[PDB]
Design a protein around this motif. Sequence first.
Motif, short mmCIF file in Angstrom:
data_model
loop_
_atom_site.label_atom_id
_atom_site.label_comp_id
_atom_site.label_asym_id
_atom_site.label_seq_id
_atom_site.Cartn_x
_atom_site.Cartn_y
_atom_site.Cartn_z
N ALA A 1 7.16 -9.57 -0.51
CA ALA A 1 5.92 -8.99 -0.95
C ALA A 1 6.00 -8.57 -2.41
O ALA A 1 5.04 -8.67 -3.17
N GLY A 2 7.14 -8.04 -2.79
CA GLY A 2 7.33 -7.69 -4.23
C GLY A 2 7.28 -8.85 -5.21
O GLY A 2 6.67 -8.76 -6.26
N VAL A 3 7.84 -9.95 -4.77
CA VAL A 3 7.79 -11.19 -5.58
C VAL A 3 6.33 -11.68 -5.64
O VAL A 3 5.87 -12.05 -6.72
N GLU A 4 5.63 -11.68 -4.51
CA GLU A 4 4.17 -12.06 -4.51
C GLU A 4 3.35 -11.20 -5.48
O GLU A 4 2.53 -11.71 -6.28
N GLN A 5 3.62 -9.89 -5.41
CA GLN A 5 2.96 -8.95 -6.29
C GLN A 5 3.26 -9.21 -7.80
O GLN A 5 2.34 -9.16 -8.69
N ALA A 6 4.52 -9.44 -8.09
CA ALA A 6 4.90 -9.77 -9.43
C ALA A 6 4.24 -11.07 -9.97
O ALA A 6 3.79 -11.16 -11.15
N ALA A 7 4.12 -12.04 -9.09
CA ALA A 7 3.42 -13.24 -9.47
C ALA A 7 1.93 -12.98 -9.73
O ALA A 7 1.36 -13.48 -10.76
N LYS A 8 1.34 -12.13 -8.87
CA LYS A 8 -0.06 -11.73 -9.08
C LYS A 8 -0.22 -10.99 -10.42
O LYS A 8 -1.20 -11.24 -11.14
N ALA B 1 0.83 -1.21 0.00
CA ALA B 1 0.00 0.00 0.00
C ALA B 1 0.86 1.26 0.00
O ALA B 1 0.35 2.35 -0.21
N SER B 2 2.15 1.18 0.32
CA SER B 2 2.97 2.37 0.40
C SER B 2 3.18 3.01 -0.97
O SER B 2 3.69 4.09 -0.99
N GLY B 3 3.05 2.26 -2.08
CA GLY B 3 3.45 2.70 -3.37
C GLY B 3 4.87 2.26 -3.84
O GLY B 3 5.25 2.49 -4.98
N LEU B 4 5.68 1.65 -2.94
CA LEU B 4 6.92 0.98 -3.42
C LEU B 4 6.62 0.01 -4.57
O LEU B 4 5.67 -0.81 -4.48
N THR B 5 7.44 0.01 -5.62
CA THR B 5 7.15 -0.82 -6.71
C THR B 5 7.80 -2.27 -6.63
O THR B 5 8.74 -2.50 -5.88
N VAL B 6 7.29 -3.18 -7.47
CA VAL B 6 8.00 -4.54 -7.56
C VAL B 6 9.49 -4.38 -7.74
O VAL B 6 10.30 -4.96 -7.00
N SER B 7 9.85 -3.50 -8.70
CA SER B 7 11.29 -3.27 -9.00
C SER B 7 12.09 -2.78 -7.82
O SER B 7 13.18 -3.26 -7.46
N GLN B 8 11.54 -1.84 -7.07
CA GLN B 8 12.23 -1.32 -5.93
C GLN B 8 12.38 -2.39 -4.82
O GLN B 8 13.45 -2.44 -4.16
#
Lengths: 713, 713
Positions: B522-529, B437-444
């Motif tokens: 969390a970024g990896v989870e998001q990328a998979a989603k 929810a912070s707005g940090l991206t998958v890449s970051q």
Amino acid sequence: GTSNRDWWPNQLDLSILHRHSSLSDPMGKDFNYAQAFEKLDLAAVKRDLHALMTTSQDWWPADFGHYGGLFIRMAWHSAGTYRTADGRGGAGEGQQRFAPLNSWPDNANLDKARRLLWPIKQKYGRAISWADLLILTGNVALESMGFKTFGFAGGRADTWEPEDVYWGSEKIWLELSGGPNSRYSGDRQLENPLAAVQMGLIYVNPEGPDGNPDPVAAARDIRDTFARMAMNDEETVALIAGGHTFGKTHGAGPASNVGAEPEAAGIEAQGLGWKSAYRTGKGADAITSGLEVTWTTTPTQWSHNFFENLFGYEWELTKSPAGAHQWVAKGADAVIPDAFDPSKKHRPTMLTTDLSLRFDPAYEKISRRFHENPEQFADAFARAWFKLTHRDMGPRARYLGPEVPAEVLLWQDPIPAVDHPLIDAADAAELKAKVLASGLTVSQLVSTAWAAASTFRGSDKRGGANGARIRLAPQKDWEANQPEQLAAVLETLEAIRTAFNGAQRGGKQVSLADLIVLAGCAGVEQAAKNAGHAVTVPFAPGRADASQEQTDVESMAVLEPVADGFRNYLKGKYRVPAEVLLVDKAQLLTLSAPEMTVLLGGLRVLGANVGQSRHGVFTAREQALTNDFFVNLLDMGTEWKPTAADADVFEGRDRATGELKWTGTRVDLVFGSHSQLRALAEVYGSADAQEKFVRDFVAVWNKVMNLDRFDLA
Amino acid sequence: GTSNRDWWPNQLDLSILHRHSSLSDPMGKDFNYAQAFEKLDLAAVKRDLHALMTTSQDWWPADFGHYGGLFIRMAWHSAGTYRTADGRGGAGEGQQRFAPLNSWPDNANLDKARRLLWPIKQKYGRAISWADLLILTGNVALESMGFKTFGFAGGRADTWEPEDVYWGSEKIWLELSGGPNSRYSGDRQLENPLAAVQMGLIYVNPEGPDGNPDPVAAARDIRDTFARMAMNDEETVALIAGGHTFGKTHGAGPASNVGAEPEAAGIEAQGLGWKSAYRTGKGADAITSGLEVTWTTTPTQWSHNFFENLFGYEWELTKSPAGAHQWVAKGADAVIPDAFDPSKKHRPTMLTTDLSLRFDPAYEKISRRFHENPEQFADAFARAWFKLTHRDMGPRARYLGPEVPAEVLLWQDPIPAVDHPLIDAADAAELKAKVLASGLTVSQLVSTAWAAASTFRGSDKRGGANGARIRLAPQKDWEANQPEQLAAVLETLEAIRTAFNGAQRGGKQVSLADLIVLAGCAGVEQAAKNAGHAVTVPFAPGRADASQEQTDVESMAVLEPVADGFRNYLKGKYRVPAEVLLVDKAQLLTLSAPEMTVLLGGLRVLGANVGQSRHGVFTAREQALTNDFFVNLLDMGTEWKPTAADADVFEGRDRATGELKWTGTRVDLVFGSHSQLRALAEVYGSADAQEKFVRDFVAVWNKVMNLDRFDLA
Ligand code: HEM
Ligand code: HEM
Ligand code: NA
Ligand code: NA
């Protein structure tokens, strides 16, 4: 970076025993290829292959609009590396895609052929291996061009690193014979285990021996190399004339136009090689071998025009555009089609090695028969093509899919179907006890079972204890098997067998093949008991007894273990040191270095040595399963020296008194010399290691007993 | 037999990623060395070691009746191979018993020392590794001779084959500088990652640089090599003067008397080497280095005589009986005892490299302080000996047994103990949702967690995400870590942390080290989603945050990832090709080739490249976890060529139109060129492979995130 192989180029190489680990494999530990293949829609793969045959890509345009010829050569070279001497090479592991095979000069432009198949490999994924696909593609080529194949079996699992094979000692690709590393000596005698005439060739030089265009002399190399690939005269003629009914060679300009083989090419080439600066570098301008021959008037259709041309013309020695020797039909018309220009035609041409099929007297008789009887030719070529492409796949139980041929062929070393109930655990315990009560010793039981099971080689999946072939010619007479001792053991076991089988109901019986193994298991269990350990050696029944009529005696010859370090046996004096031959035998048996070490230390103290030799028997409790070989070997209170009679036998003397304690061979002492083997020997020679030694020995003995049990896969 | 390395000597070697498999290991897959060691009676081992010291064997008699000096040298060489550049070498794997180290000239006659230990190794078996035994024996030798050691930790597991280390490129043992493969260039600049002056030496040449006996020039080499082994001036002086308080060198006759090193010796030598034809070949006639120097009046007892002699005499250049340069005290009496003959005494002697401790001005000041303040010398040597022998063991959580020192030292890169409740799975899901929810991206999120975790190297078990050192100097400032972007991500994470920690009860809190890793997850989870998959990435809490004061900025410099193929990063232009550097980094990360392949293909499409470089980003759905990298790389519709501006960047163009589709580096393209890597890329680029790709990527991501988690082992 300088490596251990640079510093000590003759040290034994154990890394060959540790290839193909779970580290290098991208599939899960549980992946089972046969299960994946069994669900493949093989018909759908073949319809895709069919369409591919006539769908030309502009980066390697198809000759005559049809890739059939290219893919037949691709599958013939995938299979054509096979050597009967060790079973190494062949099509069964898909090794054409790895170094060094992917970059042999004889494999030039097969990189292009493989790349054409990537779309189909990608579509079907893990359900069809590259190894199977190479062969299948050859089959579909033949089908598409009107030839009916004898069948196809799937089941060649892909491998993920290069196989360790001795391909020869030369340091120059294609070196002519007679150099400092010549593979020939005497009267053109090719060294075993090699099956090609020059480094980087499949069998022979298509110009003739060492480049000399004499068809009669070329025929001698063909017959020798083909025989070293398990093919006889009829099979040889059939394969060569069959293959060269299709397609063409490529020699459109000088070979100096061709750049680096795939392993030397730049990164941008993306796994391809032999990039050519001659005109368009492809298609009409292709250069592969440097020869420029097109054999028939319909290179994309099965026909009997190869023999019509061979016999119908007289042949003149000429040169291709790259300067290679080849032959052209005297006085002929331009009747052979051009691969790209519908307006041009060419005279019939042949290789020197094609002309062998006419000019060698024995081949001439087969070739005339095939010319006169093309149906016989077609049948021989179909059966030979099957044998070629399956000879290294192992027993028929490994053959998968809907196209397996039902006919049982002698070269498959067939084993009959089991048609009766098998023995159960209680039966096996009764048999073990009857074996032990007969008076057979631990030494006899172990030695017999070892002799039967250790003919297996993982290179072509031949041999093993299945079939009870040890009771048949030629195995029963091999010197390593101690023929008189063997006959007495087999007689006693066959009496035990007759009595047990006579007492049963319901049709239960035990085969001699299973009882030989079971008896060896009783020996190992007893040896463990003799040392104070209660263990059950595992045993899986289901082996069957093959007949002499189902046993090809000549083909069985190559399984004779002329060096068997596990029995401290060497038939003669060889240029390769005995320890290197031990590691070679471990590799064929599929053993790791720890397994090799445990097994050898155990067999020494169990009395497995041929002739009851005392070399390496470093125990005062022979026929007890102990770690004594390792404890005694590693004892610094003993000093070792080569004997004056024989520098390959060593005496171990007490360092303080001089008293003689033991003798050993190089195979024994390597475990106290080589730094990696010595580190293994130290584990089993430690004071905490006797239970571990028993367990690990039983495991590796059972592994060996089961090497050929593809019925249980 | 000619091999692939002979044909293609510059091809990348992947067998380094598949060494140390379960194939080569004689132990069961479940063996746990730490558990075995924890049960060892360490006291008993040490009593046996004490007995050994004075039990002379006739085949290598003990100097002065005591083996302590020999075993001190043995332990110091076991440790002395270490390089801080890559963490490779050192005592931690027991590699002194394998090639090449067992046969380096500087290790001459340490084969004797190790064989003297075999009865103790044998008695205790798997409960004490050779690796631990070699260091323990050094310790006991010091204690037997009156020196109180700072401590000892067990837990160095034995290894079973030679480690893959670049030791230099020279083809001649001990080659002097300036040859065709010189490790030196410029103003005596030693090439990284090497830490020795000649091939087969531990650090420096005891005669002086390239054999020239100048103590002040020798000091420059000593300071450079020792710094490259993580030791400073005070530590250096303490170690050299401490070691050379004991024992002697061996140079009784010409070196031409000495025969083959262990790996070249005859099989009858049973693992030993350097057999000498000089007189009795041993004892009083021993020849090891060629020097003949005995430093103190009591070579088998701790004393302060090293410095008394060094400062108390003036020194004259002379030669040993083998012709080697060394130094003798001017006008001195014969006060030093003979090792075998009670009626002979000798003048004090010194090596060139000993004299460096007096004639280099910075060393002189330390040496004088040690001379004047012997307690300070004793303490600094005890500390430095512990560091020497433990520098490659990793975090304190790996240290086993009852002698581990309680004092926390900077070079151990200490991490504080966790003293609060850890977050649970409910807390982890809350934190991940806050991160997303912070707005940090998958890449970051991926790039930051990658940067934090991929500092780990298995060579010396330094680095990893534990400690949150990425927020400290110097990691926060590294160019590969993108300092400005890193700061913005850390700021947002630390605000999340503050809010979560402020809301807790009891003392529960989350460390920043954990949150960095959890946020990556969390970024990896998001990328998979983003790719249509529902994936939960495993996470293990328990990492703690180290302080700047526990983080030595100078020793952290060696972990800077100047090449990181996983981020397509190269800091400068290097002589080693980038693909070789990627395989080297994979080795340090403990990855196999299939793992390296999956990992690199996923990071490319997740936006992990430094600078957001588009090289290798072969997808139109960046920040979605897909196998696009493999599918597009392997597409034959694209032709690749190096660019005119930079031969190390490649353009991939449509084959039919010429249109630019992608660009890539050597690190990207090797996966489409090397024949074994291409076989792996094909598996993940197949139509059936998207789920496999996702799941194998999650597994290898998690592996990396946990590399340094020895608190959970
Ligand atoms: C003495 C044995 C053999 C020799 C010396 C030999 C030699 C060759 C040579 C030099 C070429 C040309 C490579 C090029 O320039 O493209 C070739 C092509 C070919 N060979 Fe053989 N051959 C032998 C046996 C076989 C066998 C056993 C088969 C299959 C049953 C086979 C099938 C073919 C096919 C189909 C081609 C044509 C490839 C194309 O159309 O691109 N040959 N052979
Ligand atoms: C500049 C650093 C050093 C140099 C050039 C060096 C050189 C040598 C040489 C050439 C020998 C003789 C080998 C033989 O002929 O038997 C030796 C012996 C020895 N060194 Fe060093 N050394 C160094 C540092 C170390 C350190 C750091 C230690 C331990 C803390 C150490 C402890 C020993 C001991 C105990 C011996 C005596 C061996 C025996 O009695 O058999 N040295 N040194
Ligand atoms: Na084979
Ligand atoms: Na290390």
